[PDB]
Amino acid sequence: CGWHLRDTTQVPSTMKVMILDSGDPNGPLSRAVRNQLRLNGVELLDKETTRKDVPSLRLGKVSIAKDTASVFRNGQTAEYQMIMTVNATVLIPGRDIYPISAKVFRSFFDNPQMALAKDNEQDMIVKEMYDRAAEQLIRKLPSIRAADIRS
Template sequence: MKKLLVALFLGIFIWGTNGCGYHRYHAIEIPFGMKTLVLDTEDPYGPLAMTLHEALQLHNIHVIKRKRKNIKISSIRLQKEEISRNALSIFSDGKTSEYSITMTIFIQMIIPHKGIYPITSTVSRSFFDHPYAPLAKDTEQSIIISDMRMQAVENLIHQFLKTYYTANHTTIKLHDS
């Protein structure tokens, strides 16, 4: 009876975690060639570079500075971050009541002897505009943008792990031999 209850509880637990969309993203295996990366950016202390650097460290990826141009280590080149706002709904007096904020981050992953791979991550959120609380509105918007940046960076990390795996496990046959 005890084994049946344990099996039933374990089955419900597994069904519940899979059914609600819970996934353990931090339990991914980092390939050996990705354990050390170079982070190329024009603004090393900007919010995007700092968020990416912290996320890489959380995934146990060591980030180094490029001292010479001929280092044969994979690198990530931050290109740009775009944030756009679109009106979703309008009050009766013509003021916007709800926005859709979209953040798109463009990077390039450079894998030595394999190539340059462009990677893009896009995250969208809705934001309610409070016309009588401008200070709270600005603070709330900056928190939302910071949260979106963290989500986009996590998405980028998963994308360039897939890109690294694909680049190292595919071969292109140029000639019939």
């Protein structure tokens, strides 16, 4: 029983204040990342701010893939497998960039529904997928701080 409360912080003190930059600042992934960073105490900054001494989180391309995972006894699709990948780069001022990525998996049955109901279900699934991708992206920040020290 060597357990103890987490002494180290989630977002390293070098990244307590940082700039969030993306191709669509009003998009869903950007909103999810902004929400996740706020709950961790990170104070967001404007892209064109006057401070050239803070790390920059640059969100990249997002890919979503949906494919059949299993079939019924007549070959009809039973379940779908949904994978979203998110790429990002963290630019530490003075040092080199550090690429990170997130991959999210989601499996569900193909429930026959009306078009509106199916659209709402898919939208909810994709929104939760973005939330989990942002959560994954946040957890890679401590690995970047460790790699920066090695340099």
